[PDB]
């Protein structure tokens, strides 16, 4: 899923 991967990227950047 493209939304799930986008969210994974944002969470990685925040952390």
The residues of the shown chain that bind Mg ion, judged by CB under 5 A, are 2
| CA 3 remoteness from chain centre | 8
Residue-wise DSSP of the chain: -HHHHHHHHHHHHH-
Whole-number minimum distance, CB 10 to Mg ion, in Å?
11
Residue 2 Cα distances to 7, 9, 13, angstroms: 9, 11, 17
Of 1-15, which residues contact Cl ion (CB under 5 A)?
A: 5
CB 12 to a second copy: min, Å:
7
Residues 1-15 contacting a second copy, CB under 8 A = 1-15
- The residue ranges that bind a second copy (CB under 8 A) are 1-15
């Amino acid at each position: 899923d493209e939304l799930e991967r986008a969210i994974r990227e944002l969470a990685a950047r925040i952390k």
